[PDB]
Scaffold this motif. Structure first.
Motif, PDB file in Angstrom:
ATOM      1  N   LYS A   8       0.821  -1.393   0.002  1.00  0.00           N
ATOM      2  CA  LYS A   8      -0.061  -0.040  -0.125  1.00  0.00           C
ATOM      3  C   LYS A   8       0.847   1.262  -0.144  1.00  0.00           C
ATOM      4  CE  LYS A   8      -1.623  -2.559   2.933  1.00  0.00           C
ATOM      5  NZ  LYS A   8      -1.560  -3.899   3.142  1.00  0.00           N
ATOM      6  N   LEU A   9       0.657   2.150  -1.061  1.00  0.00           N
ATOM      7  CA  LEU A   9       1.389   3.449  -1.169  1.00  0.00           C
ATOM      8  C   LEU A   9       0.744   4.406  -1.842  1.00  0.00           C
ATOM      9  CD1 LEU A   9       3.920   5.068  -0.635  1.00  0.00           C
ATOM     10  CD2 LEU A   9       4.891   4.090  -2.796  1.00  0.00           C
ATOM     11  N   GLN A  10       0.099   5.326  -1.256  1.00  0.00           N
ATOM     12  CA  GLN A  10      -0.672   6.529  -1.754  1.00  0.00           C
ATOM     13  C   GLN A  10       0.094   7.913  -1.392  1.00  0.00           C
ATOM     14  OE1 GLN A  10      -4.786   6.713  -0.306  1.00  0.00           O
ATOM     15  NE2 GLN A  10      -5.000   8.738  -1.898  1.00  0.00           N
ATOM     16  N   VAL A  11       1.135   8.250  -2.303  1.00  0.00           N
ATOM     17  CA  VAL A  11       1.517   9.589  -2.399  1.00  0.00           C
ATOM     18  C   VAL A  11       1.221  10.230  -3.610  1.00  0.00           C
ATOM     19  CG1 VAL A  11       3.342   9.080  -0.618  1.00  0.00           C
ATOM     20  CG2 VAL A  11       3.840   8.725  -3.134  1.00  0.00           C
ATOM     21  N   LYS A  12       1.570  11.411  -3.997  1.00  0.00           N
ATOM     22  CA  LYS A  12       1.064  12.118  -4.998  1.00  0.00           C
ATOM     23  C   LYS A  12       1.940  11.564  -6.347  1.00  0.00           C
ATOM     24  CE  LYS A  12      -0.738  15.351  -2.079  1.00  0.00           C
ATOM     25  NZ  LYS A  12      -0.709  15.042  -0.533  1.00  0.00           N
ATOM     26  N   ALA A  13       1.067  11.762  -7.411  1.00  0.00           N
ATOM     27  CA  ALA A  13       1.671  11.320  -8.601  1.00  0.00           C
ATOM     28  C   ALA A  13       2.560  12.326  -9.040  1.00  0.00           C
ATOM     29  CB  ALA A  13       0.520  11.091  -9.556  1.00  0.00           C
ATOM     30  N   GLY A  14       3.857  12.128  -9.347  1.00  0.00           N
ATOM     31  CA  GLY A  14       4.914  13.027  -9.732  1.00  0.00           C
ATOM     32  C   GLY A  14       5.503  13.595  -8.550  1.00  0.00           C
ATOM     33  N   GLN A  15       5.155  13.114  -7.227  1.00  0.00           N
ATOM     34  CA  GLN A  15       5.820  13.899  -6.182  1.00  0.00           C
ATOM     35  C   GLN A  15       5.648  12.788  -4.952  1.00  0.00           C
ATOM     36  OE1 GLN A  15       7.393  16.901  -6.525  1.00  0.00           O
ATOM     37  NE2 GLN A  15       8.345  16.379  -4.481  1.00  0.00           N
ATOM     38  N   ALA A  16       6.606  12.101  -4.795  1.00  0.00           N
ATOM     39  CA  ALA A  16       6.396  11.269  -3.440  1.00  0.00           C
ATOM     40  C   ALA A  16       6.739  11.628  -2.129  1.00  0.00           C
ATOM     41  CB  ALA A  16       7.704  10.158  -3.640  1.00  0.00           C
ATOM     42  N   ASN A  17       7.227  13.050  -1.957  1.00  0.00           N
ATOM     43  CA  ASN A  17       7.504  13.659  -0.864  1.00  0.00           C
ATOM     44  C   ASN A  17       6.298  14.065   0.132  1.00  0.00           C
ATOM     45  OD1 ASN A  17       9.892  15.086  -3.027  1.00  0.00           O
ATOM     46  ND2 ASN A  17      10.515  14.453  -1.031  1.00  0.00           N
ATOM     47  N   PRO A  18       5.112  14.258  -0.276  1.00  0.00           N
ATOM     48  CA  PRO A  18       4.110  14.361   0.769  1.00  0.00           C
ATOM     49  C   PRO A  18       3.548  13.016   1.397  1.00  0.00           C
ATOM     50  CG  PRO A  18       3.504  15.582  -1.236  1.00  0.00           C
ATOM     51  CD  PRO A  18       4.538  14.751  -1.604  1.00  0.00           C
ATOM     52  N   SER A  19       4.158  12.891   2.535  1.00  0.00           N
ATOM     53  CA  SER A  19       4.123  11.501   3.276  1.00  0.00           C
ATOM     54  C   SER A  19       2.580  11.575   4.138  1.00  0.00           C
ATOM     55  CB  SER A  19       5.167  11.491   4.224  1.00  0.00           C
ATOM     56  OG  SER A  19       6.484  11.260   3.634  1.00  0.00           O
ATOM     57  N   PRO A  20       2.197  12.517   4.761  1.00  0.00           N
ATOM     58  CA  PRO A  20       0.939  12.263   5.845  1.00  0.00           C
ATOM     59  C   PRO A  20      -0.506  11.512   5.096  1.00  0.00           C
ATOM     60  CG  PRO A  20       2.011  14.314   6.158  1.00  0.00           C
ATOM     61  CD  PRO A  20       2.555  13.860   5.021  1.00  0.00           C
ATOM     62  N   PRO A  21      -0.565  11.611   3.708  1.00  0.00           N
ATOM     63  CA  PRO A  21      -1.362  10.685   3.235  1.00  0.00           C
ATOM     64  C   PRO A  21      -1.025   9.112   3.642  1.00  0.00           C
ATOM     65  CG  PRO A  21      -1.132  12.170   1.459  1.00  0.00           C
ATOM     66  CD  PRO A  21      -0.324  12.861   2.623  1.00  0.00           C
ATOM     67  N   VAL A  22       0.472   8.766   3.739  1.00  0.00           N
ATOM     68  CA  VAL A  22       0.546   7.428   4.268  1.00  0.00           C
ATOM     69  C   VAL A  22       1.552   7.590   5.421  1.00  0.00           C
ATOM     70  CG1 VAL A  22       0.203   6.008   2.172  1.00  0.00           C
ATOM     71  CG2 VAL A  22       2.226   7.250   2.481  1.00  0.00           C
ATOM     72  N   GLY A  23       2.381   8.485   5.443  1.00  0.00           N
ATOM     73  CA  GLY A  23       3.401   8.818   6.541  1.00  0.00           C
ATOM     74  C   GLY A  23       4.571   7.935   6.461  1.00  0.00           C
ATOM     75  N   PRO A  24       5.237   7.316   7.492  1.00  0.00           N
ATOM     76  CA  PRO A  24       6.265   6.212   7.831  1.00  0.00           C
ATOM     77  C   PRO A  24       5.823   4.903   7.217  1.00  0.00           C
ATOM     78  CG  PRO A  24       6.452   7.506   9.476  1.00  0.00           C
ATOM     79  CD  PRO A  24       5.051   7.969   9.060  1.00  0.00           C
ATOM     80  N   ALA A  25       5.507   4.823   5.791  1.00  0.00           N
ATOM     81  CA  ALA A  25       4.746   3.446   5.141  1.00  0.00           C
ATOM     82  C   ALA A  25       5.712   2.900   4.481  1.00  0.00           C
ATOM     83  CB  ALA A  25       3.727   4.016   4.369  1.00  0.00           C
ATOM     84  N   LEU A  26       6.884   3.200   4.205  1.00  0.00           N
ATOM     85  CA  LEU A  26       7.920   2.211   3.551  1.00  0.00           C
ATOM     86  C   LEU A  26       9.122   2.228   4.011  1.00  0.00           C
ATOM     87  CD1 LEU A  26       7.068   2.859  -0.320  1.00  0.00           C
ATOM     88  CD2 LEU A  26       6.038   0.896   1.045  1.00  0.00           C
TER      89      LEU A  26
END
Ligand code: MG
Ligand code: MG
Ligand code: MG
Ligand code: MG
Ligand code: MG
Ligand code: MG
Ligand code: MG
Lengths: 140, 120, 173, 38
Positions: A8-26
């Motif tokens: 499961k990984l939901q961050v922005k398309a073209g920008q992995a940097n915004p984390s609090p949609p998943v936070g420390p997820a990987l």
RNA sequence: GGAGGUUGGCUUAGAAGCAGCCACCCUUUAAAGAAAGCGUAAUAGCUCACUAGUCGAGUCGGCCUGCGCGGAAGAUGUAAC
RNA sequence: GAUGUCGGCUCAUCACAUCCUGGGGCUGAAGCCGGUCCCAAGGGUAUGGCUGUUCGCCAUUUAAAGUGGUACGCGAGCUGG
């Protein structure tokens, strides 16, 4: 190494940097979030950017992370199908006005009908199995 | 002093005049207490103004007795009168000036205070 | 299926000094292994070996399976070096082997000086590793267990001797 | 251990062994499923 | 390998297959339950459900029934053949 | 045609369903402390104030101030509240 899908990984398309949609997820997965941005940059403008984009990631350890070519996402754009943003408090029995089959046309035009389906009609039947998610039935 | 309910006075300035033993601390039932032991006193007869009120449970060390202290010789020091020195919650004394002699048998690490404050 | 039907197929240099009741395997890389069989067994002689009971009880049905794995372990011991990998986890821990003496630092007050039995010779390639070489499984596994029970591991830090089973207990709050 | 009169499994990992005449339960996942007598 | 959508939803870094109430459909595919299940309660992982090889004869559960086993600790001395 | 009844003193002996010390398993056990349950009867197991009291409530200790059986142990051994 880390070989199973449905990661499961939901961050922005073209920008992995915004984390609090998943936070420390990987972190325990092995590869940190900040290096996946070169892979989210490879698939932009169709996978619903701006909002954070879920994608089935295939974790490797050789600086290569392929994303399965699902052009239109059916996890978030089927919130847009009924016309809401925030889903119901319980799926498929609690309702805000459910989605029908007449409003499943604009999403289903660009399905890439071999890379996620066999024909185009089963990709319309994919979002007939993907709109049963968020307080919405598939009725007709 | 050396038994429960043993009247003995204090050797201290801020204290009372007389106290009384109620419990010999130490083991299971220590029946006697020699020179250099912790007892627990009640205050029986205070001075008209000192520091310690009448009728208060305190803690004291024993410093003089008529039974004497015995050394590793046949040589004993034997006073005439019993005497205690009051303590705080921690084992430091309350007063300032100690009256009369003490013995050098008492001096351990925790009792280097009252040995220095007394004219032996 | 049953392990009592599969044969042994011993390798090249193997002597069988079989007196019927008492077998004896000799080979290279250590020798002198022998076992006294429980009496209700048939032992053939060939390039391989086959075991067979006589009285079809619930016991000799299990005796022939036990004695097959015991003879098979004597074959590998004169063919392959048995080993046990023990690692050390924790700060201030080390192992300093001096010949036939294995002396340890485990955070105690006095240092333990574990003495090895004859046969087994242990070697330390690191300060946090033990390699226990031998010829029999039961004697190598016994010595490796008694070293471990000096300081067993911990679910909160792992600070203790542990072998290569990486299924160690963990909890952390 | 947990001395009972009715030992039984709790998860998929518990195997029921009868060791030296007593019905034990050992669990390789959680230690809190270890049951002694029953 | 262990699923295609996919973070399945309001939710919460995390509720996703593993807050709560729940969705349980449909399909890339030889294969896959949007999930049994511990795993960081939670992200993995590894399993389960599944299919390919590998292995080459039995295996799995329930019912009735004979004799037994735990449940089973007391006061002067073994001390309910 | 008689088996002297409550509490105290003296002297005791057994049980284990353990209060202390000895050995261990699990923990919502970081460490110091604990909680709970299996094994163990070898030696220990408080002085006082108040009441006829056992009991109790207090003050101060201690490693701990265990629960029961023995005519609710013990008057041809004492006391007589
Ligand atoms: Mg045993
Ligand atoms: Mg018992
Ligand atoms: Mg008569
Ligand atoms: Mg017992
Ligand atoms: Mg009586
Ligand atoms: Mg008389
Ligand atoms: Mg009599």
């Amino acid at each position: 190494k880390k070989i199973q899908a449905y990661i499961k990984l939901q961050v922005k398309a073209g920008q992995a940097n915004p984390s609090p949609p998943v936070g420390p997820a990987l972190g325990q997965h092995g590869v940190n979030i900040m290096e996946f941005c070169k892979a989210f940059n490879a698939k932009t403008q169709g996978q619903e950017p701006g909002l954070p984009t879920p994608v089935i990631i295939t974790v490797y350890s050789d600086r290569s992370f392929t994303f399965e070519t699902k052009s239109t996402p059916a996890a978030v754009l089927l919130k847009k199908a009924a016309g809401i943003t925030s889903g119901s408090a319980r799926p498929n029995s609690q309702k805000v006005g459910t989605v029908t089959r007449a409003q499943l046309e604009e999403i289903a035009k660009t399905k890439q009908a071999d890379l996620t389906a066999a024909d185009l009609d089963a990709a319309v039947r994919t979002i007939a199995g993907s709109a049963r998610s968020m307080g919405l039935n598939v009725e007709g | 002093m050396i038994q429960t309910q043993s009247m003995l006075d204090v050797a201290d300035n801020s204290g009372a005049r007389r106290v009384m033993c109620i419990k010999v601390l130490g083991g299971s039932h220590r029946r006697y207490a020699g020179i250099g032991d912790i007892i627990k006193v009640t205050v029986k007869e205070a001075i008209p103004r000192g520091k310690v009120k009448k009728g208060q449970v305190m803690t004291a060390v024993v410093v003089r007795t008529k039974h004497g202290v015995r050394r590793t010789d046949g040589s004993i020091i034997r006073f005439d009168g019993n005497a205690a020195v009051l303590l705080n919650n921690k084992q430091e004394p309350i007063g300032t000036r100690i009256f009369g002699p003490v013995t050098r048998e008492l001096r351990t690490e925790k009792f280097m205070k009252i040995v220095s404050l007394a004219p032996e | 299926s049953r392990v009592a039907k599969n044969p042994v197929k011993l390798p090249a240099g193997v002597e069988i000094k079989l007196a019927g009741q008492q077998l004896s395997i000799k080979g290279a890389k250590g020798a002198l292994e022998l076992k006294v069989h429980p009496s209700v067994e048939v032992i053939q002689d060939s390039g391989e070996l086959r075991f067979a009971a006589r009285n079809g009880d619930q016991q000799t049905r299990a005796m022939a399976g036990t004695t097959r794995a015991l003879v098979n372990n004597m074959v590998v011991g004169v063919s392959q070096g048995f080993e046990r990998k023990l690692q050390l986890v924790g700060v201030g821990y080390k192992a300093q082997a001096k010949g036939q003496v294995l002396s340890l630092s485990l955070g105690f007050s006095h240092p333990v000086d574990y003495e090895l039995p004859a046969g087994i010779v242990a070697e330390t390639p690191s300060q946090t590793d033990i390699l226990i070489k031998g010829i029999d499984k039961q004697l190598v596994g016994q010595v490796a267990a008694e070293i471990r029970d000096f300081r067993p591991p911990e679910p909160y830090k792992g600070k203790g001797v542990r072998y290569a089973d990486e299924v160690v207990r963990r909890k952390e709050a | 251990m947990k001395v009972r009169a009715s030992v039984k499994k709790l998860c998929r990992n518990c195997k029921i062994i009868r060791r030296d005449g007593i019905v034990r339960v050992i669990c390789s996942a959680e230690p809190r499923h270890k049951q002694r007598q029953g």
